[PDB]
Amino acid sequence: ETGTLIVNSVLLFLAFVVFLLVTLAILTALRLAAYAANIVNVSLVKPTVYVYSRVKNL
Amino acid sequence: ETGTLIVNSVLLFLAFVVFLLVTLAILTALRLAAYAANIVNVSLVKPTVYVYSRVKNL
Amino acid sequence: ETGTLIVNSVLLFLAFVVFLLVTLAILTALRLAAYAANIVNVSLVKPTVYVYSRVKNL
Amino acid sequence: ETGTLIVNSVLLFLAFVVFLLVTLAILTALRLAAYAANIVNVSLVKPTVYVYSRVKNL
Amino acid sequence: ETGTLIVNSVLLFLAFVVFLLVTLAILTALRLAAYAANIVNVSLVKPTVYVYSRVKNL
Prior knowledge:
mainly alpha, transmembrane (chains A, B, C, D, E), homopentamer, about 60 residues, Envelope small membrane protein (chains A, B, C, D, E), membrane (chains A, B, C, D, E)
């Protein structure tokens, strides 16, 4: 808190970790956790360039 | 507030207990709170290992 | 602001009254405000015990 | 920010104007923007009394 | 922060750029990122007039 504003993005990461429990309860309830597994194992090789389309706007 | 940056998570914990009133309103409206009840009673024994899948990221 | 830490929940309560315009905009667009009406008149008599399952966690 | 605690509701209004892009992309994707058009023109004359059911709770 | 309250909207823009990772995980999960791709390249030429419907409300 001593001249550190980056703590504001830290609390935002905590809101993304709990939203993972709600979002996971849906795909698992519909029976498709077998197709979502590979997504959590990091599959950002082709659609990973989506981060570059974010740098243009800001 | 004297050198305590850990208060940035106390406000986030208050943002989780409030979404509980929203998400519960959905599962109760679909008539399935009888199955979600046992989940609020702490059923983290088998899928509890999901916490270790977050320690590898940070 | 003389030691009034309990004001952190006041801003959270104001972020809850506004979110009511979002959820209402959804159920009203699906034509079911006739069933949600009685809910606004406070129907917490039977499912009101859901607050006790929150005191155990904290 | 000189004693103005009403700025906490200003940032909440900014999260609503952007949520309009999300909700509109749903009614427009399903092809029914012709029925939603008259809603943005403000048709709060009969169901406008819904703001009175909020004064009783708070 | 010296007489600048315009910083309250800067933290809101940080909450939209992070929400892009969630919503993007939805359209990509349903396999339709090929149609949403032309949307990030800015296609506001015809539905761009939607910002005029916000000037009337406020």
